[PDB]
Structures are given as structure tokens and as C-alpha cells.
Amino acid sequence: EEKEILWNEAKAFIAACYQELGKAAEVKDRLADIKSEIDLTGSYVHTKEELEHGAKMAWRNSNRCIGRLFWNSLNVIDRRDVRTKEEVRDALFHHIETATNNGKIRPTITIFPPEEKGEKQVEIWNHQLIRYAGYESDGERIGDPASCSLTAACEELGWRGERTDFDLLPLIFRMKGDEQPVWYELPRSLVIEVPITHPDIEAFSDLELKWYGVPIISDMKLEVGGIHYNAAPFNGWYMGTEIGARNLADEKRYDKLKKVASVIGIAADYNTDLWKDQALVELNKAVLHSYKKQGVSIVDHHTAASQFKRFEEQAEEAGRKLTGDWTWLIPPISPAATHIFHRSYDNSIVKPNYFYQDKPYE
Amino acid sequence: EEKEILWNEAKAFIAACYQELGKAAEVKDRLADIKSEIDLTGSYVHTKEELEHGAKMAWRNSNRCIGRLFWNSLNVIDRRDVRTKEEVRDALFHHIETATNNGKIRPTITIFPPEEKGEKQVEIWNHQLIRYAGYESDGERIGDPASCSLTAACEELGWRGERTDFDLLPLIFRMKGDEQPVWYELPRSLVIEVPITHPDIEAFSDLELKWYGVPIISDMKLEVGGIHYNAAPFNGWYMGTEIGARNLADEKRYDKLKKVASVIGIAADYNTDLWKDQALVELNKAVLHSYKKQGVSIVDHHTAASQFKRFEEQAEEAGRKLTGDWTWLIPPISPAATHIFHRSYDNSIVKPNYFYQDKPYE
Ligand code: HEM
Ligand code: HEM
Ligand SMILES: Nc1ccc2ccc(CNCCc3cccc(F)c3)cc2n1
Ligand SMILES: Nc1ccc2ccc(CNCCc3cccc(F)c3)cc2n1
Numbered sequence: 105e106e107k108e109i110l111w112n113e114a115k116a117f118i119a120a121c122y123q124e125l126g127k128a129a130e131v132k133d134r135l136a137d138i139k140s141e142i143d144l145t146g147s148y149v150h151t152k153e154e155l156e157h158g159a160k161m162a163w164r165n166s167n168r169c170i171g172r173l174f175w176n177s178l179n180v181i182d183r184r185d186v187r188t189k190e191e192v193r194d195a196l197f198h199h200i201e202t203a204t205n206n207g208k209i210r211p212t213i214t215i216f217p218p219e220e221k222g223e224k225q226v227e228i229w230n231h232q233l234i235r236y237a238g239y240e241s242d243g244e245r246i247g248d249p250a251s252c253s254l255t256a257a258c259e260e261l262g263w264r265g266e267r268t269d270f271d272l273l274p275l276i277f278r279m280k281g282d283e284q285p286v287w288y289e290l291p292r293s294l295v296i297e298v299p300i301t302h303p304d305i306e307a308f309s310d311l312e313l314k315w316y317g318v319p320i321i322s323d324m325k326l327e328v329g330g331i332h333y334n335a336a337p338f339n340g341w342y343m344g345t346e347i348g349a350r351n352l353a354d355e356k357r358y359d360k361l362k363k364v365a366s367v368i369g370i371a372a373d374y375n376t377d378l379w380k381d382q383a384l385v386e387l388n389k390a391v392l393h394s395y396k397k398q399g400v401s402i403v404d405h406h407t408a409a410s411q412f413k414r415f416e417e418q419a420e421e422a423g424r425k426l427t428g429d430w431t432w433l434i435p436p437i438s439p440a441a442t443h444i445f446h447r448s449y450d451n452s453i454v455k456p457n458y459f460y461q462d463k464p465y466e
Numbered sequence: 467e468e469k470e471i472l473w474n475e476a477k478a479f480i481a482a483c484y485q486e487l488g489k490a491a492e493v494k495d496r497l498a499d500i501k502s503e504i505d506l507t508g509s510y511v512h513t514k515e516e517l518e519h520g521a522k523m524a525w526r527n528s529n530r531c532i533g534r535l536f537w538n539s540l541n542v543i544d545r546r547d548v549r550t551k552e553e554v555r556d557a558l559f560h561h562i563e564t565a566t567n568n569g570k571i572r573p574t575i576t577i578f579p580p581e582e583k584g585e586k587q588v589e590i591w592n593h594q595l596i597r598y599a600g601y602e603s604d605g606e607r608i609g610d611p612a613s614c615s616l617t618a619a620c621e622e623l624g625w626r627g628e629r630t631d632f633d634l635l636p637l638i639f640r641m642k643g644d645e646q647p648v649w650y651e652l653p654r655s656l657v658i659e660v661p662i663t664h665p666d667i668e669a670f671s672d673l674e675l676k677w678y679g680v681p682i683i684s685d686m687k688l689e690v691g692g693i694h695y696n697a698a699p700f701n702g703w704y705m706g707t708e709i710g711a712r713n714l715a716d717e718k719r720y721d722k723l724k725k726v727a728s729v730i731g732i733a734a735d736y737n738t739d740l741w742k743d744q745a746l747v748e749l750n751k752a753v754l755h756s757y758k759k760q761g762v763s764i765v766d767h768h769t770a771a772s773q774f775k776r777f778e779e780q781a782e783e784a785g786r787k788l789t790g791d792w793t794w795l796i797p798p799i800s801p802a803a804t805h806i807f808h809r810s811y812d813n814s815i816v817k818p819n820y821f822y823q824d825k826p827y828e
């Protein structure tokens with residue numbers, strides 16, 4: 105059954121991929137080669153062209169992603185050759201460097217060897233390569249609550265955080281054959297951070313807020329033609345609301361809205377004053393302003409939605425079905441000011457794609 | 467088949483309704499009476515108790531409604547007795563008066579005779595009893611674009627609007643047996659309107675914005691135990707975002723955001739300035755402030771969401787399933803600041819309920 109599942113996905117993917125690459129005539133010979141290889145070995149190996157286009161298709165098919173217009177310019181790094189933890193570490197370090205690109209962020213994915221018999225070759229524990237630690241003890245809350253369980257797992261392994269609100273978590277990953285993951289402190293020279301200031305309100309810097317420049321998601325599985333790349337970190341650049349409306353705003357995250365209201369000089373006493381809404385707007389203006397000022401790529405939600413409209417238009421004229429998750433595509437502020445809010449989307453799952461997978465801690 | 471459909475819904479409704487009213491023992495005798503009546507007449511007549519509780523249940527089951535906490539205090543007016551257009555007119559006038567209640571809005575429904583053989587007894591053309599007209603000709607846009615087709619239909623019938631941006635549409639409805647609806651101008655003494663001013667920004671009154679006090683939805687069908695009340699206008703009070711984030715903000719409605727930005731003294735040139743977001747917040751603060759100042763009931767979206775949380779809690783402890791439409795329950799501004807955004811809802815349709823129906827014009 106596993107072999108049949110693999111072969112079916114392989115047939116679907118190779119046909120579609122080669123059609124898009126104008127290589128339709130080669131499909132017949134390639135599929136035969138694949139069928140023999142699966143019969144012989146239980147699996148098959150993608151060509152570099154297949155892997156690159158597959159990672160791109162998977163981004164294109166990500167229903168929840170508003171940034172899909174740029175799917176075809178994804179920078180794919182093939183690291184199926186790594187065998188050692190030093191190599192994995194250095195590949196991760198390299199990804200941070202090349203994706204960051206001095207602030208001019210390059211959308212990038214680094215692809216590690218895939219699962220064999222469902223057996224992982226490399227197992228990355230980080231949610232993102234750059235992420236802040238979180239602590240909770242005796243009612244005391246420090247840093248990012250969403251990082252509490254990973255932080256606790258790191259500290260089991262001999263890591264110790266400084267317990268600022270912005271401790272950088274180490275890289276942590278496990279190799280096939282090892283019972284325990286290893287961890288490495290991030291070289292600070294690789295990590296760009298942005299202090300949050302406001303264009304008009306000088307007092308905003310009193311909050312001493314900051315965020316990291318590049319979100320590099322490292323815990324999703326890339327699936328391409330029935331091959332499972334559980335370890336394949338990728339990045340784009342941030343949409344501002346991700347930071348200003350969620351990471352810094354949510355009560356279960358950094359929960360900064362009351363403090364924002366105070367520094368912008370409004371009362372936080374009455375729902376009818378819409379103080380949360382006003383605070384959200386100013387914090388979000390601050391985030392966009394700060395990233396731009398530092399020369400780190402970012403997009404606002406209006407521009408992002410305009411790009412997504414073009415993605416919809418592009419899909420139609422290319423004759424491809426559009427899929428999307430309305431509930432995630434709408435931005436968490438002024439959603440009705442975007443075209444997204446006013447239409448619907450088919451939420452069917454199409455492969456290649458990126459998928460959630462179980463945490464190895466917890 | 468129609469009779470079977472009716473009887474099945476009747477059985478389901480009477481059982482549930484009488485359970486809730488502690489009248490479970492009476493179900494057996496009532497259902498027999500109903501079965502005979504359907505056999506004899508093709509239909510059945512609700513008791514006053516059944517009708518009142520049915521209209522309440524239908525509100526409770528409205529998946530898209532954030533205001534459901536107060537479902538049980540709905541004021542039900544039984545007008546199944548009306549036979550003439552003067553009576554219908556006067557009932558509609560009465561509803562406006564009693565619901566308005568000098569600004570202290572009473573949630574109210576007036577129920578007219580139901581469809582017979584799918585044959586309407588009274589057919590109301592208005593979307594709401596109080597609503598502004600809309601005009602479009604030679605590129606010239608006046609009033610509410612969403613009212614353009616009804617406005618045009620009214621003007622076919624000899625009505626003429628003054629062509630201000632806030633012309634009150636007349637009541638328009640058709641009686642069984644008539645080929646044409648009749649229309650009646652609304653007495654202005656019945657209609658409360660609210661001028662939009664801002665608490666801090668004096669210039670806001672330069673926009674000369676206003677809205678009506680009470681939204682009285684008059685084009686949905688109430689269904690109760692297989693009986694179709696196509697004519698049954700109802701009202702609550704507004705949630706502020708309905709006016710400030712949609713009616714006055716949408717590009718296809720009054721489209722006021724650029725003008726709002728100008729009077730609050732910000733540029734409307736760059737997406738990254740989040741000028742639409744800031745304008746939306748101030749316009750919405752203005753709406754809430756204005757209604758409160760005039761003594762007309764209104765709720766903000768934060769308070770409304772807090773009430774809805776209590777509705778969820780109430781449903782659970784009463785042992786009732788909760789149903790909801792996430793995409794409509796989230797407010798169109800700062801949705802992630804409400805608990806609604808962070809959970810999911812079962813969107814199953816449960817009866818009694820309110821339903822859309824085809825427009826008799828267009
Ligand atoms: C280039 C800039 C990009 C922008 C501005 C962008 C924007 C976004 C945003 C705002 C989200 C919602 C995230 C959340 O609320 O947690 C998202 C989700 C997502 N994006 Fe993108 N994205 C970009 C690039 C990429 C790239 C390069 C990939 C992969 C190759 C990708 C795949 C996804 C996926 C899989 C999700 C869903 C994650 C989940 O379900 O939790 N995006 N994107
Ligand atoms: C008491 C104050 C009330 C508030 C604050 C409230 C709030 C809301 C809001 C904000 C909407 C969304 C409307 C839109 O975006 O177009 C809504 C929808 C709805 N409400 Fe309520 N509501 C209230 C009372 C009522 C009453 C009295 C009924 C009927 C008895 C009702 C039934 C509905 C229905 C059926 C919808 C869906 C309409 C549609 O699909 O277009 N509500 N409510
Ligand atoms: N700009 C982008 C691009 C791709 C992304 C892909 C994934 C994500 C994060 N999605 C999950 C966020 C999350 C999940 C669970 C807990 C939590 F705190 C936060 C953000 C992205 N941002
Ligand atoms: N406060 C309330 C309560 C109940 C409501 C019930 C219905 C509505 C309106 N829902 C449809 C609005 C609409 C539909 C179609 C076109 C349009 F311009 C506007 C608003 C309500 N507001």
C-alpha cells in the first residue's frame with residue numbers, strides 16, 4: 105500500500121511538473137525509470153529540476169499564504185547530500201545568511217534528505233530558525249509564551265537562556281541514529297533585529313520592543329510526488345500585521361496593547377473608545393516604519409492583498425484552479441478594506457504542498 | 467411531499483419548543499391536532515406561545531449573528547390578523563415607533579400572515595423599513611449604491627426622491643391579489659437619525675455624515691415548524707462597525723475613507739502609512755460617540771464579542787449545541803482582538819431560523 109501511495113503521487117506530480125516545464129514528451133521514460141526504482145528500492149530520487157519546481161509548486165498551493173504571487177522566484181538550495189550534524193548546522197547558518205542578504209530578503213528553501221521508511225534522516229526541533237525563548241514560573245512570564253515548551257526542552261539539554269524577553273533560542277535538531285538532539289548557539293553576526301520606533305511618537309521607543317528580520321519556518325514537511333521532506337526550512341519576508349497585530353499584540357503572546365495605549369497617550373478604560381483598535385494601528389505603523397528605516401524587507405497588508413489579487417489573475421490566465429483559506433488570507437486588521445474579504449475561496453488541498461507535523465518534544 | 471415536509475418540521479419543532487417551555491406532556495395531544503389540521507386544510511396554525519417562542523428560537527439559531535445573547539427577550543408582535551394594505555402600513559409604522567422607543571431600542575419582530583400554497587399574503591419589497599435611496603446615471607452617484615435597484619423600482623411606481631445622499635425610501639409592499647405594490651412615504655417624526663461627529667476632531671462634522679437609528683430588516687423569511695413567514699420584519703440595535711466599517715466605508719457603499727483621512731489631517735498617499743486603518747478607527751469612534759451622545763442604543767464590537775462569549779457559555783450549560791458562521795461573526799475591524807477569531811464554529815443550519823429569499827424586483 106505504501107508503494108502504491110508513492111507511485112500514484114509520483115505519476116500525478118511528474119505529469120504536472122513536466123507539463124509546466126514543457127517537457128511532456130519525457131514523462132513516459134521518466135515514469136518507467138521511477139517505477140523500476142520504486143520496485144527495486146522502495147523509493148525514488150528527484151532530479152534537481154523536479155525538486156526545485158516541486159518546492160515552488162508547493163508554495164503556489166499553500167492555501168493560507170497571501171504572498172504566493174512570487175512563487176516562481178523561490179531560491180531552492182539542494183542539501184540532500186548532508187550526512188553530519190556539522191553539515192546540517194552549517195547549512196542552517198548558510199540559509200540564515202543568504203536569505204537575510206543584508207536586509208534585502210531572498211525567499212529561500214534549504215532541502216535536507218527526505219524520510220525513508222517514514223524514518224527521518226534529520227529532525228529539526230525549532231519552529232523557526234530565529235525565534236525568541238519563553239519562560240513561565242511562579243506566575244512570572246518572560247519572553248515569548250509560544251516558545252515555552254521548546255525553551256524548556258532546550259534547557260533540559262544543558263542550554264541556559266539569559267531570561268531577557270528576547271533570548272535567541274539555539275538551533276536544535278536530531279540526526280538519525282541519535283537518541284538526543286544537539287544544540288548550537290546562533291552567531292549574533294548572522295541575526296538582524298529591528299528596534300521598534302514610531303514615525304511621530306518619540307515615546308514609543310520607551311517600550312523597548314524589537315523583532316527579528318527574517319521568519320524562517322523550519323518545522324513543516326514539504327511533500328513532493330509522494331516523497332516526504334520533513335526537514336526543509338523556508339522563508340519569505342514578513343507581512344507587518346504578523347508582528348504588530350499578533351506576535352506583539354495577542355494576549356497569549358507579548359500582549360503589548362495596554363502599554364502601547366499608554367505611550368501613545370490614550371486611555372485604556374472604555375471599550376467604546378476603541379483604544380485597542382487605535383493601539384493596534386499605531387503599533388502596526390511603527391513596525392512597518394521600523395523595518396523600512398533599517399532596510400529590512402517587509403510588506404504591509406494592503407500591498408500584500410493587491411499582490412494576491414494579481415496571483416488570482418495570473419492563476420486564471422494560466423488555466424490553473426485557485427485554492428485558498430479565506431480565514432487565514434484575510435489580514436487581522438482592516439480585513440474588509442481588502443478584496444479578499446469580499447470573495448470566497450476553494451479550500452481544497454492540492455499537492456505538492458507544505459504540511460504541519462507532530463512536535464518531537466511535548 | 468409538501469405535506470410530509472410540513473408534518474416532519476412540525477413534529478420536530480413542537481417537541482423541542484414544548485420541552486423548552488416545560489410543556490412536554492402536551493406534545494402528544496397537540497401533534498394529533500396538528501396532523502388532523504394538515505390533513506384537513508393542508509396547513510396548521512401556531513398558538514401565540516408557539517409563534518413567540520419560535521421567533522426567539524430562530525434568532526438563537528442565526529449562525530451569523532453576534533448579538534444572540536439576548537434572544538429570549540425578543541418582543542414579538544402577532545399581526546396574522548391583517549387583511550388590508552392600510553393595516554399592513556399601520557403595523558409597519560407601529561413597529562418603527564415601538565422598536566425605536568425614543569432611542570432606547572427594543573428588539574422587536576412583527577409577524578404577518580404566512581405563505582399558503584407558497585402563495586404570499588403580504589410581500590415586502592424593502593430590505594429595511596428605514597433605508598436610504600441610491601442613484602446612478604451619467605457617471606453620477608448619489609446616496610446608497612446598495613439601494614439602486616429598489617430606488618429605480620420605486621420611481622417606476624410614481625415615487626420621486628429629492629436626490630440627496632440620504633433620501634428615505636418609502637415603504638413598499640404588495641398584497642395577495644394585486645399586480646403592483648403600493649408605496650407610502652415615511653413620516654419623518656417616526657425616524658430617528660444621528661449626525662456623525664467626532665469626540666476630539668471638530669472638523670469631522672464637515673463631512674455631513676449621518677445614519678438612521680434602527681436597522682429593521684424586512685426582507686428575510688422566518689421559518690417555524692414548516693410554516694413560512696416570508697413577511698416578518700425584525701430589529702435589534704446596531705453594532706458600530708456595521709456603519710463605520712461597512713455602510714460608510716466600503717468602496718461600493720458610501721466610500722468615505724479618503725474624505726475621513728483628509729478631515730483627520732493625515733495623508734492618503736501610501737499604503738505603509740496605514741491611512742485606511744487609521745481612518746477606519748476614527749470613523750468608528752465617531753459613530754459610537756455620536757449614537758451615545760444622542761441617546762440611541764448601539765454596541766461596540768468588543769462589548770458585543772464579550773456578550774457572545776456569554777451566549778456560548780449559556781448554550782453549553784443549557785445543553786444546547788452552538789452553531790455559528792465564523793466568517794460573519796468576526797468584526798471587520800480588529801477581529802484578532804476578539805475571542806471569536808481564535809476559535810471555530812459549526813456552521814450547520816438549525817430550524818427555526820431566518821432565511822434569504824428572492825427579490826420581487828430585479
Ligand atoms: C515572500 C513573502 C511572503 C509573505 C509576505 C507571506 C505571507 C504569509 C502570511 C502573512 C502567512 C500567515 C502566517 C500566520 O498567520 O501564521 C503565510 C502563511 C504561509 N506561507 Fe507565506 N508568505 C511569504 C512567503 C512564503 C514562502 C517563501 C513560503 C514557502 C515556500 C510560504 C508558505 C506559507 C505557508 C505554508 C503558510 C501557512 C503556515 C501555517 O499554516 O501555519 N510563504 N504567508
Ligand atoms: C440586539 C442587537 C443585535 C445586534 C447587535 C446584532 C448584531 C448583528 C450583526 C453585526 C450582524 C451582521 C450583519 C451584517 O454584516 O450584514 C447580525 C446578523 C444577523 N442578525 Fe443580529 N444583531 C442583533 C439582533 C438581532 C435580532 C433581533 C435578530 C432577529 C430576531 C437578529 C438576526 C440576525 C440575522 C438573521 C443575521 C444575519 C443576516 C444576513 O445573513 O445577512 N439579530 N447581527
Ligand atoms: N511571512 C511568512 C511566510 C510564511 C509563513 C509560514 C508560517 C508562519 C507561521 N504560521 C504558524 C504561526 C504559529 C503557529 C503556532 C503557534 C504560534 F505561536 C505561531 C508564518 C509565515 N510568515
Ligand atoms: N444589528 C443587526 C441585527 C440584525 C441584522 C440582520 C441583517 C443585517 C444585514 N445583513 C445583510 C446586509 C446587506 C446585504 C446585501 C446588501 C447590502 F448592501 C447589505 C444587519 C443586521 N444588523
Ligand SMILES: C[C@H](O)[C@H](O)[C@H]1CNc2nc(N)[nH]c(=O)c2N1
Binds near residue numbers: 431432809
Ligand atoms: C487561532 C485560530 O487558529 C484562528 O481560528 C485562526 C484564524 N485565522 C488566522 N489567520 C492567520 N493568518 N493566522 C492565524 O494564526 C489565524 N488564526
Ligand SMILES: C[C@H](O)[C@H](O)[C@H]1CNc2nc(N)[nH]c(=O)c2N1
Binds near residue numbers: 445446447793
Ligand atoms: C461580501 C462577502 O459576502 C464576504 O465574504 C462576507 C464576509 N463576512 C462578512 N461578515 C459580516 N458580518 N457581514 C458581511 O457582509 C460579510 N461579508
Ligand SMILES: [Cl-]
Binds near residue numbers: 319346351
Ligand atoms: Cl512569526
Ligand SMILES: [Cl-]
Binds near residue numbers: 681708713
Ligand atoms: Cl445596515
